[PDB]
């Protein structure tokens, strides 16, 4: 496959936040 | 084990030692390997080539 | 005593000493090129897990 | 503080912001980095 | 194995001085 899993537990600790795309003007 | 088990994060890979042999490993200059090869010359492109 | 050494010999063989101190050294490496921002939040992640 | 890609993804999607080295330096040693840029 | 839960913010309990908001004259 591609990419790479990471434990959740791991990631909830680390705190990752995460952003929407979107399309609009700069 | 409990610790290598818990406290780990994504691209930190972990590692356990003792303070004392840490120590004397850190200043430590030298080379691990049983068997080194310093290829040395003028302009790191060439060498990192070799 | 020929008979006896030559088989008990074959046995496990492993590098030399380790001594164990009360308190233990951990060091977790990652990749190079973090900022002291990050790398400093990391090292509080990883003490509050220890 | 916002970039803008003239291609490369599609509305809806979600990226990540936080803990964005770690993350990534994991998928490169996961081989991952390596992987999606040889997958073409 | 361990799912043990941790937070991820920032935190600061051993060197902080605060301030309390004012209402005076400059
Ligand atoms: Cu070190």
């Known amino acids: 496959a591609s990419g790479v899993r990471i434990d959740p537990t791991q990631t909830q600790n680390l705190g990752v936040k995460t952003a929407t795309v979107t399309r609009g003007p700069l | 084990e409990e610790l290598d088990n818990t406290v780990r994060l994504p691209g930190l890979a972990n590692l356990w030692v003792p303070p004392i042999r840490n120590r004397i490993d850190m200043l430590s200059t030298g080379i691990k390997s049983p068997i080194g090869i310093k290829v040395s010359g003028t302009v790191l492109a060439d060498i990192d080539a070799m | 005593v020929l008979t006896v050494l030559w088989p008990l010999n074959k046995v496990g063989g492993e590098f030399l000493p380790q001594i164990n101190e009360g308190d233990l050294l951990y060091m977790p490496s990652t990749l190079p090129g973090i900022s002291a921002a990050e790398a400093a939040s990391m090292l509080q992640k990883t003490d509050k897990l220890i | ?40």
Do not use: Y
């Open chain 4, 1 to 40: 503080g916002v970039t803008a890609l003239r291609s490369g993804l599609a509305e809806g999607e979600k990226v990540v912001s936080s803990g964005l080295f770690l993350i990534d330096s994991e998928a490169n040693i996961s081989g991952a980095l390596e992987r999606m840029r040889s997958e073409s």
